[PDB]
Design a protein around this ligand. Structure first.
Ligand SMILES: c1cc(CNc2ccc3c(c2)OCCO3)ccn1
Ligand SMILES: c1cc(CNc2ccc3c(c2)OCCO3)ccn1
Length: 330
Protein backbone atom coordinates (compact mmCIF):
# COMPACT_ATOMS: atom_id res chain seq x y z
CA UNK A 1 0.00 0.00 0.00
CA UNK A 2 0.87 3.68 -0.24
CA UNK A 3 -0.51 7.04 0.87
CA UNK A 4 -0.05 10.60 -0.36
CA UNK A 5 -1.31 13.75 1.36
CA UNK A 6 -0.81 17.45 0.79
CA UNK A 7 0.66 19.47 3.64
CA UNK A 8 -0.14 23.20 3.86
CA UNK A 9 1.54 26.08 5.74
CA UNK A 10 -0.60 27.39 8.60
CA UNK A 11 0.38 31.00 7.92
CA UNK A 12 2.37 33.28 5.61
CA UNK A 13 5.67 32.51 7.39
CA UNK A 14 5.51 28.70 7.18
CA UNK A 15 5.49 28.55 10.98
CA UNK A 16 4.16 24.98 10.74
CA UNK A 17 2.39 22.72 8.26
CA UNK A 18 -0.92 20.89 8.59
CA UNK A 19 -2.02 17.71 6.86
CA UNK A 20 -5.59 16.37 6.82
CA UNK A 21 -6.04 13.04 8.65
CA UNK A 22 -9.19 10.89 8.73
CA UNK A 23 -10.01 9.41 12.14
CA UNK A 24 -12.84 7.05 12.98
CA UNK A 25 -16.00 5.78 11.31
CA UNK A 26 -17.56 7.75 9.76
CA UNK A 27 -14.38 9.73 9.15
CA UNK A 28 -13.66 12.80 11.23
CA UNK A 29 -11.05 14.89 9.39
CA UNK A 30 -8.59 16.80 11.58
CA UNK A 31 -5.64 18.88 10.42
CA UNK A 32 -2.54 17.56 12.19
CA UNK A 33 1.04 18.76 12.44
CA UNK A 34 3.21 15.88 11.17
CA UNK A 35 6.22 15.85 13.50
CA UNK A 36 9.31 13.75 12.83
CA UNK A 37 10.63 14.94 16.22
CA UNK A 38 8.01 13.22 18.40
CA UNK A 39 6.05 9.98 18.55
CA UNK A 40 2.53 10.70 19.82
CA UNK A 41 -0.58 11.09 17.68
CA UNK A 42 -2.77 13.34 19.81
CA UNK A 43 -5.85 15.39 19.04
CA UNK A 44 -8.15 18.04 20.36
CA UNK A 45 -11.28 16.16 21.37
CA UNK A 46 -14.69 16.18 22.98
CA UNK A 47 -12.74 15.49 26.21
CA UNK A 48 -10.57 18.62 25.99
CA UNK A 49 -11.31 21.15 28.75
CA UNK A 50 -13.85 23.45 27.09
CA UNK A 51 -12.06 26.72 27.94
CA UNK A 52 -8.93 25.34 26.22
CA UNK A 53 -10.64 24.84 22.84
CA UNK A 54 -10.79 27.92 20.59
CA UNK A 55 -11.62 27.15 16.96
CA UNK A 56 -9.94 23.75 16.56
CA UNK A 57 -11.74 20.80 15.05
CA UNK A 58 -12.24 18.08 17.65
CA UNK A 59 -12.32 14.29 17.55
CA UNK A 60 -15.43 12.87 19.24
CA UNK A 61 -14.79 9.19 19.93
CA UNK A 62 -18.40 8.54 20.98
CA UNK A 63 -19.43 9.28 17.36
CA UNK A 64 -16.98 6.73 15.92
CA UNK A 65 -18.24 3.17 15.66
CA UNK A 66 -14.65 1.89 15.49
CA UNK A 67 -13.32 3.82 18.53
CA UNK A 68 -12.41 1.82 21.63
CA UNK A 69 -11.12 3.19 24.93
CA UNK A 70 -7.64 1.86 25.63
CA UNK A 71 -8.40 1.04 29.23
CA UNK A 72 -6.11 2.57 31.81
CA UNK A 73 -3.86 4.31 29.29
CA UNK A 74 -2.80 7.91 29.74
CA UNK A 75 -0.31 10.18 28.02
CA UNK A 76 1.49 13.43 28.76
CA UNK A 77 3.97 15.26 26.58
CA UNK A 78 6.10 18.37 26.71
CA UNK A 79 7.83 19.89 23.69
CA UNK A 80 11.05 21.86 23.37
CA UNK A 81 9.23 25.19 23.36
CA UNK A 82 7.63 24.50 26.74
CA UNK A 83 4.19 23.64 25.35
CA UNK A 84 2.38 20.54 26.58
CA UNK A 85 -0.73 18.39 26.46
CA UNK A 86 -2.07 15.25 28.16
CA UNK A 87 -5.07 12.95 28.31
CA UNK A 88 -6.34 9.42 27.72
CA UNK A 89 -6.24 7.05 24.75
CA UNK A 90 -8.50 5.41 22.19
CA UNK A 91 -7.73 3.05 19.37
CA UNK A 92 -9.42 3.82 16.08
CA UNK A 93 -9.00 3.70 12.32
CA UNK A 94 -6.69 6.42 11.00
CA UNK A 95 -6.12 7.21 7.32
CA UNK A 96 -3.60 9.55 5.71
CA UNK A 97 -3.80 10.23 2.00
CA UNK A 98 -5.53 6.92 1.32
CA UNK A 99 -3.32 4.79 3.60
CA UNK A 100 -5.31 3.21 6.44
CA UNK A 101 -4.18 1.85 9.80
CA UNK A 102 -6.66 0.04 12.01
CA UNK A 103 -6.14 0.01 15.77
CA UNK A 104 -4.02 3.17 15.80
CA UNK A 105 -3.57 4.78 19.21
CA UNK A 106 -5.31 8.15 19.09
CA UNK A 107 -4.37 10.15 22.15
CA UNK A 108 -7.28 12.33 23.23
CA UNK A 109 -6.34 15.59 24.94
CA UNK A 110 -7.98 16.43 28.24
CA UNK A 111 -5.61 19.38 28.72
CA UNK A 112 -3.52 21.50 26.37
CA UNK A 113 -1.25 24.45 27.08
CA UNK A 114 -2.24 27.98 26.10
CA UNK A 115 -0.11 28.01 22.97
CA UNK A 116 -2.20 25.18 21.51
CA UNK A 117 -5.48 26.84 22.49
CA UNK A 118 -4.34 30.08 20.89
CA UNK A 119 -3.57 28.40 17.55
CA UNK A 120 -6.85 27.58 15.87
CA UNK A 121 -5.17 25.99 12.82
CA UNK A 122 -3.60 22.93 14.48
CA UNK A 123 -5.98 20.19 15.63
CA UNK A 124 -3.21 17.96 17.02
CA UNK A 125 0.11 16.29 16.26
CA UNK A 126 1.02 13.14 14.34
CA UNK A 127 4.39 11.90 15.52
CA UNK A 128 6.81 10.28 13.07
CA UNK A 129 9.92 9.81 15.23
CA UNK A 130 10.68 6.35 16.67
CA UNK A 131 8.05 4.67 18.81
CA UNK A 132 10.49 4.44 21.74
CA UNK A 133 9.59 8.12 22.43
CA UNK A 134 5.84 7.50 22.65
CA UNK A 135 4.52 8.72 26.01
CA UNK A 136 1.54 6.40 26.53
CA UNK A 137 1.58 4.66 29.91
CA UNK A 138 1.57 1.90 31.07
CA UNK A 139 1.74 0.36 27.58
CA UNK A 140 3.75 2.36 25.05
CA UNK A 141 2.07 2.72 21.66
CA UNK A 142 3.33 2.71 18.07
CA UNK A 143 3.38 5.59 15.63
CA UNK A 144 1.21 5.65 12.54
CA UNK A 145 4.28 4.90 10.41
CA UNK A 146 5.39 2.06 12.68
CA UNK A 147 1.91 0.49 12.39
CA UNK A 148 1.71 0.99 8.61
CA UNK A 149 5.23 -0.01 7.61
CA UNK A 150 4.78 -3.78 7.09
CA UNK A 151 1.91 -3.05 4.69
CA UNK A 152 3.75 -0.38 2.70
CA UNK A 153 5.25 -1.10 -0.72
CA UNK A 154 8.56 0.15 0.73
CA UNK A 155 9.15 0.97 4.44
CA UNK A 156 9.63 4.70 3.90
CA UNK A 157 7.95 8.04 4.07
CA UNK A 158 9.01 11.29 2.42
CA UNK A 159 8.67 14.95 3.34
CA UNK A 160 8.49 17.53 0.55
CA UNK A 161 7.69 20.78 2.33
CA UNK A 162 6.97 23.94 0.33
CA UNK A 163 8.35 27.43 0.77
CA UNK A 164 5.31 29.64 1.22
CA UNK A 165 3.35 26.92 -0.61
CA UNK A 166 1.82 23.46 -0.07
CA UNK A 167 3.91 20.30 -0.26
CA UNK A 168 3.52 16.56 0.17
CA UNK A 169 3.95 13.69 2.60
CA UNK A 170 4.14 10.31 0.87
CA UNK A 171 4.09 6.91 2.55
CA UNK A 172 5.44 3.73 0.98
CA UNK A 173 7.07 5.08 -2.18
CA UNK A 174 9.59 7.57 -3.50
CA UNK A 175 8.18 9.94 -6.14
CA UNK A 176 11.08 10.16 -8.56
CA UNK A 177 9.49 13.20 -10.24
CA UNK A 178 9.60 15.26 -7.01
CA UNK A 179 13.33 16.00 -6.89
CA UNK A 180 16.28 16.84 -9.11
CA UNK A 181 19.52 14.89 -9.38
CA UNK A 182 20.08 11.99 -6.99
CA UNK A 183 19.12 11.27 -3.39
CA UNK A 184 22.11 11.08 -1.04
CA UNK A 185 21.57 8.72 1.87
CA UNK A 186 23.25 9.16 5.23
CA UNK A 187 23.41 7.14 8.46
CA UNK A 188 20.91 7.53 11.29
CA UNK A 189 21.25 6.91 15.00
CA UNK A 190 18.01 5.92 16.72
CA UNK A 191 19.60 5.96 20.19
CA UNK A 192 17.73 9.11 21.28
CA UNK A 193 14.53 8.15 19.41
CA UNK A 194 15.06 10.75 16.67
CA UNK A 195 16.01 10.77 13.00
CA UNK A 196 19.49 11.78 14.11
CA UNK A 197 22.24 12.18 11.52
CA UNK A 198 25.54 14.01 10.95
CA UNK A 199 25.85 16.79 8.41
CA UNK A 200 29.27 17.11 6.78
CA UNK A 201 29.50 20.91 7.00
CA UNK A 202 28.20 24.23 5.76
CA UNK A 203 28.72 27.33 3.65
CA UNK A 204 27.37 30.86 3.97
CA UNK A 205 26.27 32.48 0.72
CA UNK A 206 28.90 32.08 -1.99
CA UNK A 207 31.57 31.36 0.63
CA UNK A 208 33.81 28.33 0.82
CA UNK A 209 32.43 25.12 2.31
CA UNK A 210 33.56 24.34 5.85
CA UNK A 211 33.97 20.62 6.44
CA UNK A 212 32.81 19.87 9.97
CA UNK A 213 30.57 17.22 11.52
CA UNK A 214 27.26 18.55 12.82
CA UNK A 215 25.11 15.99 14.61
CA UNK A 216 21.43 16.89 14.61
CA UNK A 217 17.89 15.74 13.99
CA UNK A 218 15.60 15.97 10.97
CA UNK A 219 12.51 17.51 12.57
CA UNK A 220 9.49 18.54 10.52
CA UNK A 221 7.82 19.71 13.75
CA UNK A 222 10.39 22.46 14.45
CA UNK A 223 10.06 25.67 12.43
CA UNK A 224 13.66 26.92 12.37
CA UNK A 225 17.21 25.68 11.80
CA UNK A 226 19.10 25.41 15.11
CA UNK A 227 22.87 24.99 14.80
CA UNK A 228 26.00 25.50 16.92
CA UNK A 229 26.72 29.07 17.96
CA UNK A 230 29.92 29.21 15.89
CA UNK A 231 28.04 28.34 12.69
CA UNK A 232 25.16 30.71 13.41
CA UNK A 233 27.53 33.60 14.21
CA UNK A 234 29.36 33.01 10.91
CA UNK A 235 26.03 33.22 9.05
CA UNK A 236 24.70 36.40 10.69
CA UNK A 237 28.08 38.16 10.42
CA UNK A 238 27.31 38.35 6.69
CA UNK A 239 24.15 40.43 7.29
CA UNK A 240 24.72 44.13 8.05
CA UNK A 241 23.09 45.10 11.30
CA UNK A 242 22.20 41.57 12.41
CA UNK A 243 22.60 40.87 16.11
CA UNK A 244 21.59 38.43 18.79
CA UNK A 245 18.87 39.94 20.96
CA UNK A 246 18.35 38.45 24.41
CA UNK A 247 15.07 40.38 24.74
CA UNK A 248 13.62 39.00 21.50
CA UNK A 249 15.19 35.57 22.02
CA UNK A 250 17.56 35.14 19.09
CA UNK A 251 19.15 36.71 16.06
CA UNK A 252 17.31 39.61 14.47
CA UNK A 253 18.20 41.56 11.37
CA UNK A 254 17.06 44.69 9.56
CA UNK A 255 14.01 43.95 7.46
CA UNK A 256 15.71 45.92 4.64
CA UNK A 257 18.44 43.26 4.32
CA UNK A 258 18.92 40.79 1.51
CA UNK A 259 19.83 37.50 3.27
CA UNK A 260 22.56 35.17 1.98
CA UNK A 261 21.84 31.51 1.33
CA UNK A 262 23.00 28.77 3.69
CA UNK A 263 24.33 25.43 2.45
CA UNK A 264 24.49 22.24 4.49
CA UNK A 265 26.32 19.03 3.62
CA UNK A 266 24.84 15.57 3.27
CA UNK A 267 27.81 13.32 2.63
CA UNK A 268 29.47 14.78 -0.46
CA UNK A 269 26.18 16.41 -1.54
CA UNK A 270 25.02 19.93 -0.76
CA UNK A 271 21.56 21.35 0.02
CA UNK A 272 21.17 25.10 -0.52
CA UNK A 273 18.68 27.04 1.59
CA UNK A 274 17.85 30.30 -0.26
CA UNK A 275 18.19 33.47 1.79
CA UNK A 276 14.47 34.18 1.57
CA UNK A 277 13.75 30.96 3.51
CA UNK A 278 15.63 32.44 6.48
CA UNK A 279 13.32 35.50 6.83
CA UNK A 280 10.67 35.13 9.56
CA UNK A 281 9.42 38.67 9.27
CA UNK A 282 8.90 41.50 11.74
CA UNK A 283 9.41 40.64 15.40
CA UNK A 284 6.12 42.44 16.14
CA UNK A 285 3.60 43.97 13.77
CA UNK A 286 5.03 47.02 12.00
CA UNK A 287 8.59 46.54 13.27
CA UNK A 288 11.58 46.96 10.96
CA UNK A 289 13.48 44.33 12.96
CA UNK A 290 13.00 40.85 11.48
CA UNK A 291 13.47 37.45 13.12
CA UNK A 292 16.07 35.08 11.73
CA UNK A 293 15.40 31.53 10.57
CA UNK A 294 18.82 30.24 11.64
CA UNK A 295 19.30 30.31 15.42
CA UNK A 296 21.72 28.93 17.96
CA UNK A 297 21.11 25.49 19.46
CA UNK A 298 23.31 26.35 22.47
CA UNK A 299 20.41 26.51 24.95
CA UNK A 300 18.67 23.39 23.56
CA UNK A 301 21.23 20.60 23.78
CA UNK A 302 20.67 19.33 20.24
CA UNK A 303 21.01 20.67 16.71
CA UNK A 304 17.73 20.69 14.82
CA UNK A 305 17.30 20.61 11.05
CA UNK A 306 13.79 22.00 11.18
CA UNK A 307 11.48 23.21 8.44
CA UNK A 308 13.83 25.99 7.24
CA UNK A 309 16.34 23.30 6.24
CA UNK A 310 13.99 20.48 5.28
CA UNK A 311 11.85 22.60 2.96
CA UNK A 312 14.94 23.14 0.75
CA UNK A 313 15.08 19.38 0.09
CA UNK A 314 13.16 16.25 -0.77
CA UNK A 315 13.70 14.15 2.35
CA UNK A 316 13.43 10.37 2.63
CA UNK A 317 12.80 8.84 6.05
CA UNK A 318 13.89 5.26 5.41
CA UNK A 319 12.45 2.93 8.05
CA UNK A 320 14.24 -0.20 6.89
CA UNK A 321 15.71 -2.51 9.54
CA UNK A 322 18.66 -0.12 9.72
CA UNK A 323 17.05 3.30 9.21
CA UNK A 324 18.69 5.97 7.04
CA UNK A 325 17.87 9.48 5.79
CA UNK A 326 18.00 10.65 2.19
CA UNK A 327 18.23 14.20 0.89
CA UNK A 328 17.83 15.50 -2.66
CA UNK A 329 17.66 18.98 -4.12
CA UNK A 330 14.38 19.92 -5.80
C1 LIG B 1 6.42 19.63 18.25
C2 LIG B 1 5.34 20.26 18.83
C3 LIG B 1 5.46 21.58 19.22
C4 LIG B 1 4.31 22.28 19.91
N1 LIG B 1 4.38 23.72 19.76
C5 LIG B 1 4.09 24.31 18.55
C6 LIG B 1 3.62 23.56 17.48
C7 LIG B 1 3.34 24.17 16.27
C8 LIG B 1 3.55 25.53 16.13
C9 LIG B 1 4.06 26.28 17.19
C10 LIG B 1 4.33 25.67 18.40
O1 LIG B 1 4.35 27.61 17.08
C11 LIG B 1 4.36 28.08 15.72
C12 LIG B 1 3.19 27.53 14.97
O2 LIG B 1 3.22 26.10 14.92
C13 LIG B 1 6.67 22.21 19.00
C14 LIG B 1 7.70 21.50 18.41
N2 LIG B 1 7.60 20.22 18.04
C1 LIG C 1 9.58 30.18 14.61
C2 LIG C 1 8.35 31.02 14.86
N1 LIG C 1 8.30 32.23 14.06
C3 LIG C 1 8.66 33.46 14.57
C4 LIG C 1 8.58 34.60 13.78
C5 LIG C 1 8.94 35.84 14.28
C6 LIG C 1 9.39 35.94 15.58
C7 LIG C 1 9.48 34.80 16.39
C8 LIG C 1 9.12 33.57 15.88
O1 LIG C 1 9.91 34.85 17.69
C9 LIG C 1 10.55 36.08 18.04
C10 LIG C 1 9.88 37.27 17.45
O2 LIG C 1 9.76 37.19 16.03
Amino acid sequence: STGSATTTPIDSLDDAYITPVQIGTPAQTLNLDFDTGSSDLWVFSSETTASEVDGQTIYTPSKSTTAKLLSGATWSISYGDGSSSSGDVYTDTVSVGGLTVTGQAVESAKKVSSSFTEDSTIDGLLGLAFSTLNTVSPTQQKTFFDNAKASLDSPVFTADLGYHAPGTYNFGFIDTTAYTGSITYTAVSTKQGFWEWTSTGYAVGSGTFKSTSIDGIADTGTTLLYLPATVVSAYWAQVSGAKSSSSVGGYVFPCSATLPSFTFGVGSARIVIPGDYIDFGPISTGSSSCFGGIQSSAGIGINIFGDVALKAAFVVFNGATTPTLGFASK
